[PDB]
Structures are given as C-alpha cells and as structure tokens.
Amino acid sequence: SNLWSTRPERVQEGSTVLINGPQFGWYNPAYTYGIGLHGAGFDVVGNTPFAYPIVLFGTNSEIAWGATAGPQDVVDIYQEKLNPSRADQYWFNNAWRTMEQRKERIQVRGQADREMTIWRTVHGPVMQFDYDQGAAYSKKRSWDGYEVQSLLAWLNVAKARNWTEFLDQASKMAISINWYYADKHGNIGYVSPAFLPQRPADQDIRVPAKGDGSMEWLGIKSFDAIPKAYNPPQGYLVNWNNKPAPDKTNTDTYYWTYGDRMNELVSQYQQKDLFSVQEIWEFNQKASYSDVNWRYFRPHLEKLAQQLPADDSSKAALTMLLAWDGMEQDQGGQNAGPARVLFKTWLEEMYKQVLMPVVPESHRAMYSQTGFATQQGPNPGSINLSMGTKVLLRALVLEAHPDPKRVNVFGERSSQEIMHTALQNAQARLSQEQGAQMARWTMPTSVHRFSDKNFTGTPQTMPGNTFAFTGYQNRGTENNRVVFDAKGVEFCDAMPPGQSGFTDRNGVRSPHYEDQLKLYENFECKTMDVTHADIRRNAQSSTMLLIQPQP
Amino acid sequence: QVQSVEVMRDSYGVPHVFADSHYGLYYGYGYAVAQDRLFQMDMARRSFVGTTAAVLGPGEQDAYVKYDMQVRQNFTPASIQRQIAALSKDERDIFRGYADGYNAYLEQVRRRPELLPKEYVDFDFQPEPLTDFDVVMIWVGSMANRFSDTNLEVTALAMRQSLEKQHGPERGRALFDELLWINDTTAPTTVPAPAA
Ligand SMILES: [Ca+2]
C-alpha cells in the first residue's frame, strides 16, 4: 500500500496533494465501494473497502485522509507447558491453572453439523497444540476489547476539521494502522496509532514470550510512543509499507532493510525542485513497472563490470544489463528485454549458494523465493523484496563494516566472487534451455488478475468470472487523488472495475459493472462530485425512501 | 421519529445519501450496497463470522469447514456482543440502520424474484438478512483481523529450533540473528523525517 502526499511548497500550482494507493489485491466484484454521506453532521465523499460504515479513503473539503497497513507489534504469543496428566491445564503462576473452554457449532450444507472446542488462556485463545513437546501457544492482542471503539474513532475522522482533532480521534485507536493527514491550508500529517504494550527487556521480539507468568507486559505505552510526523522540512510525506519511525523496531512479522520499495517513490521528489499535480499523479506509472530491488545491486554489478577484464569474462551480459531500467516493458506477451530474465535467474543463483546451506530446508522457501510477478498465478499484490534479497543486502553492509561478534553469510568468500559465479550460472541456466541467444532472452510478461473470490478463499461470485490485463501494474487495488485549490476540493479516483457487482439472473450485467476498468488501466481518473451543487446537478438516477426508526 | 432518505446515483453509479439522522444516513447507505453487491456482502459476512460451509462445501478437501472453525478461534462472540450494546443510541444507529437498510432491498428480492443475482441460483441457496453484529464482523474480520492480527512468532521460533540442532546452540542463534533481526539496520527509510 503506497501513499504519497505533498504540500504547496513542492507543487507548482500551490495545492495540498494527497495520493493514496491501498493494496489489498485485485478482486471481482470490486473490493471497494464508493459513497457520499451527507447529513447529521457528516459530509464526506470517497470510497471504502467492504462497504464499511467508515469511509477509509475520502475527503471532506476540510481534510483529506488515507490509510496503509500498520507496522507495529500488538500481538504477542506466549508458550506454556501443559500438564502431561491433564492436557487441559496449563501453568501461569504459581501452579497449574485450568484452561477456559467455549464450544462452537458449525453448520454444513448437505452434511451434519460439526462441533469444535476453542481453548483460551489468561493471555488469549490457544492457536496451536503441541502434545509431544508438552506446550500450547496462545494469542494475546493489545486491541482486544477495543474493536468497536476503533471503528467509531476511525469513523469520526469524517467529523474532524483540523489536525489537533485528528489525533483526538487517533488516540482512541487500538489496532495498528497508518493514518495520513491533509487539509486545505497546505498542512500534511502522519499518524501510526496503536495500543503499544510496555514489554519486558528479556523478551526477544521474534519469538514467543514465556507463559509461566515470568514474562508479562507492564501496560500500555503513552501516546508519545506513537510515530507522529506533522509538517516536515522536506515538504512531503511518502509511505510504501516501511518503518513507522526512525526510533522504531521490527515487528515479529515485518522486517525491513535499507533496500525498501518506498525509494521508488521518494527518489522522484529529488528529481525536480517543483512539479505540477499531473507530474505527482505521474509518479505512479514510474512505480507500477519499476523493479524494486534493481536499484541496490546495480552499483555492485557495475563495479564488477568495469573492474573486469573486458578480454573474455562474459562481460557481454553485464553490458546489456546496466543500461536496463527497472521497468518491465513487454511485447504482446513476451518481455522486450533479456535483462529482467537474467536479473531474476541471477537472484535465484545467489540464493542457491548463499541462503541454501545456512537456512533450514523447512522454511528454505521463505528465504529463497525471488518475489516479482510472472504471468502464471498467483500474484499477491505488492512485489517488494523477499527475505532472501534483504538478508543478501545487509550482508553486503556486514562485509563492508565487519562485526567480530556477528556472523557473515558470505563467510570464506567475497561478495563479488559469488556474484561472478551466479551470473555465469544464470547465463549457463538461460543458455541451457532458453534459445541461448542474449538477443532473444525473454520471459513471459506478468498478467494482472481479478480473483473470483476474496482473500480467505471464499467465492464472491461464480467460478470463472475473472478479469485479465496485458499488462501488470504494481499499484493499489484502488487509486485516489485529492487536490485543494483556493477554488475548493476535487476527489479523483478510479476503483476498477465498477461499483456494481450485480448480474441480472438472465446474464446481463449492470451498466456500471466494468465502467472503471479501462480507465484504471490507462491511469485515468473519474471525478467524484463533492459540493452539493455538483451532486444536485450531476446525478442521473434519484430514488427516495420513507422510513421511521422505532425501537 | 419519522424522516425521509434519498439515494442519488452519479454518472458512474455511486450513491450519495441525504438524511437528517444517523439511522437514515446508513439506512440509505446499507440499502444501496444491497443493490450493487448483494452476493459479495453475503459471502463477505459469512467469511468473517464463519458460516461458509453452511451454504457450500465441504471441500474440495474440507476447506470450508476448516476455515469456519478457524475463524471462530480468532473471534470471541461474547466480547463483541457486549461491546456493541454499551454504545449510545446515536452510535448504535450506524450499525442498525445499515443492517435494516440492507434488508429493506433484500425483502424486495424475496417479493420480486427478477431482482435476484445470478450467483444465488448457480450456487443454489437463499439470501439471508443482515444483523448489526454481522456488520461489525465484516470490519474486525477484514480490517483488524487481516492487517493487524498478523503474527510470525511461532514459525520464527521453529527456525531457531531447527538451526539449534544442526548448528546450535552456540552458532545456532548467531545465524538466526542474521536471518531475522530484532531491530533493522539504521540505514532504512522512514516516512517520518528522521531529524532531517
Ligand atoms: Ca509479537
């Protein structure tokens, strides 16, 4: 999920621009629902996922807001020893404690109901049972019991008129979520609210804590621990699923390094002193195709090529690669450039003799995957960099700055010795099967897909009802842009394919079933009516409902 | 308490609701969602409450029944039940109006079979009314239950254990710190300006 918001300092047409790109994956019907709520204090316009009461991505002529994933550890797991005699009894303090139990009824179509039992300890529900090790793992959430408070607090950002009211509502949030602020005056802000637990220093954040009551939280951090970035000297704020704040740690699930995808959006601000709103809207195209990990290996591959004997060292590959930009331009199915094929296969050869022997085989696949998109499914959404690409990158830092207590993955070898071999192995791999002609080096282009089911695996529609691209673009599931000018505000989005997942029982679709798929492909925007006069004038179909809300 | 709500469609088909109360604003909102996404929302709700197997399945290989239980593990229905009830009338109306509005159009398709989405016939089941509990469940199920419940602690520990039996316990944790690091390199990029 990528958001980048700028202020009038940096934009030629003096306007607070706020472009957000939520990444949930692409599905049919639309993952998002666009609506305008006017009345009872509410005056909002925009779109929200799962047609929530809350409008996640919208503007109100007073504040434009957005959201990306929350990168903070609010969920700790505790391991507890189970009594070999009574497996339904754990140990908290200072003796055996009986586990709580709630039983659940699951209706099945065509078959009889199946009954399950859910275990829960002082910390929370038991997620995994290991009988032979005599340990059960329970899940503790920091936001448990504050779910509906988080809904309303998120929902009431619609009422917010300024920056100081925004934190007054952000403070009530218990879940980890990145919030972004923009208003009409030229002010931009960023909040990452969460109920952060004060945890003991004995706790290793990667692994579960001890459930014998020895390792327990000390409470909840004060609101000053929450990352807050309001009005920066740079004149812009940009997030692409990275660290929340310099003085922050890595979540048990989220690990970052200096190789980060947000550099593909930040770098463009350093390109020119002042850009127009069209140019900032055009920052996305240069990010949708650009390879994420190419920026960092280029100097290593270049340094080799120049220091190499041009006599005969297979430099023919290195001279066709360095000119290549991260872009993934294709041709009616097949890629135009050999470079991305060779960069893919080179990375895999870097895994083959780097993170192969050191990493255990069980999760070996977690570290030795390449990451980027192929025509064959499936595609998650955000390319990013795999754990193996990241470990390889910070090991280069470790070689450059040796730490005697710390162990290196290269070991007995230089970084270039392995790279040289991997390049020749990649060349030998492409030469073995592939036509074996650098002038014909091609891999099939990534294809963008719309799943006929949600992320859980549960179908949203009849099996087969899907959409395809040419065409893959690494962007948001939806793209919204908010511009503020002395004149007023302008909401600019284009959630594909449409806002109507209705298919008339005969077979015909609603006119707005895919009236937003051709413009998403072309990075075009659809204007959402914001000021009443526009809603009054531009509405085609109006239906009135009469009701009385009584107990 | 008696009022009127008007749902307006723009050139692209998005609703604009006009009402004087909390109930009406979400009655019209919930109403329009039933028109555009009746089957998606039904299947969204069933996915986050854990009633997928009730209409389809099980399988192929008991996958539906395996998730319905699995989702029941990740939410305590009693906790959310008392949470919703404690809300004030005005705050309670957002979820009630939404559920009542969604059902308003949903009882038109029960009367007019011509408005039934093709998906229900092909899957051979009936549309079910929505509750305020189901509305909340759709959020905490795909809001803080997908992007905030994410945890890789157990599998991270299982990594140390496998390494500690082939390299541990002296050099088993040293390689573990390189694969998974508590704190990032300080070189990485942050959206909030780091003293710069
Ligand atoms: Ca944790």
Side-chain angles (χ1 to χ4, degrees), chain A residues 73 75-77 199 205 252, chain B residues 151 153:
Chain A
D73 198 14
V75 181
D76 281 332
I77 282 184
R199 43 172 63 96
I205 202 159
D252 74 66
Chain B
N151 178 98
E153 277 182 24

Side-chain angles (χ1 to χ4, degrees), chain A residues 360-363, chain B residues 157-167:
Chain A
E361 53 275 355
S362 39
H363 356 140
Chain B
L157 167 136
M159 197 159 202
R160 181 197 278 178
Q161 256 73 304
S162 184
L163 273 162
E164 276 199 42
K165 291 176 184 63
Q166 138 206 294
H167 291 137

Side-chain angles (χ1 to χ4, degrees), chain A residues 38 40 45 111 120 138 143 151 178 198 203 213-214 244-245 322 336 380 429 476 505 519:
Chain A
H38 326 95
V45 79
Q111 290 182 22
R120 152 164 206 153
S138 60
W143 48 268
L151 272 110
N178 289 339
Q198 263 275 41
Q203 197 178 8
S214 301
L322 295 170
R429 210 161 82 93
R505 214 163 93 258
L519 117 160

Side-chain angles (χ1 to χ4, degrees), chain A residues 30 32-33 50-52 77 102 109 141 204 206 244 250 252 256 367 456 499 505 540-541 543 545 547, chain B residues 3 5 7 9 15 29 36-37 40 47 53 55 72 74-75 98 113 142 152-153 160 177 179 181 184 192:
Chain A
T32 329
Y33 195 96
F50 280 134
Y52 301 139
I77 282 184
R102 64 169 175 103
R109 180 147 182 256
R141 302 162 202 169
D204 207 5
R206 280 97 96 268
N250 277 15
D252 74 66
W256 304 279
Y367 278 73
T456 62
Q499 160 127 316
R505 214 163 93 258
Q540 285 189 348
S541 183
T543 176
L545 301 161
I547 48 156
Chain B
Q3 51 174 18
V5 193
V7 180
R9 302 283 183 179
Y29 178 30
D36 294 332
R37 327 274 181 83
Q40 190 197 24
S47 184
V55 276
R72 302 290 176 101
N74 290 61
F75 90 99
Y98 195 94
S142 61
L152 267 69
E153 277 182 24
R160 181 197 278 178
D177 290 14
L179 300 168
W181 55 95
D184 201 346

Side-chain angles (χ1 to χ4, degrees), chain A residues 353-355 357-358 391-392 395-396 398-399 402 406-418, chain B residues 175 178:
Chain A
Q353 64 199 284
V354 174
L355 288 169
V358 59
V391 167
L392 204 65
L396 294 157
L398 179 54
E399 179 169 294
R406 186 144 148 246
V407 178
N408 194 22
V409 205
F410 297 104
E412 60 168 42
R413 299 171 77 182
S414 179
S415 293
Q416 291 208 312
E417 292 178 321
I418 304 182
Chain B
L175 304 165
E178 306 311 291

Side-chain angles (χ1 to χ4, degrees), chain A residues 385-514:
Chain A
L385 317 72
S386 132
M387 291 300 282
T389 317
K390 291 186 177 180
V391 167
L392 204 65
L393 283 168
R394 56 140 36 201
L396 294 157
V397 172
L398 179 54
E399 179 169 294
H401 312 270
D403 210 309
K405 197 71 83 280
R406 186 144 148 246
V407 178
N408 194 22
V409 205
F410 297 104
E412 60 168 42
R413 299 171 77 182
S414 179
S415 293
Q416 291 208 312
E417 292 178 321
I418 304 182
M419 281 181 183
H420 199 344
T421 315
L423 187 83
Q424 291 176 326
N425 290 164
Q427 271 193 291
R429 210 161 82 93
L430 271 70
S431 74
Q432 195 178 7
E433 67 229 348
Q434 195 75 236
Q437 258 286 73
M438 316 211 17
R440 235 358 177 186
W441 283 160
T442 181
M443 67 179 291
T445 322
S446 48
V447 181
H448 225 270
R449 303 190 180 195
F450 287 83
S451 298
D452 43 293
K453 42 193 166 71
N454 58 24
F455 54 90
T456 62
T458 316
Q460 297 173 140
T461 187
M462 41 210 167
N465 205 144
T466 183
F467 288 93
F469 240 58
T470 144
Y472 195 109
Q473 307 157 333
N474 180 210
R475 51 193 282 189
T477 302
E478 178 270 333
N479 279 156
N480 54 292
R481 166 188 56 182
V482 193
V483 275
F484 284 140
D485 27 35
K487 11 144 47 4
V489 65
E490 187 222 45
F491 192 80
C492 220
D493 70 323
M495 92 186 63
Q499 160 127 316
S500 194
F502 176 65
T503 308
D504 197 45
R505 214 163 93 258
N506 298 139
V508 66
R509 293 132 163 247
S510 179
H512 308 292
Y513 199 101
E514 52 189 278

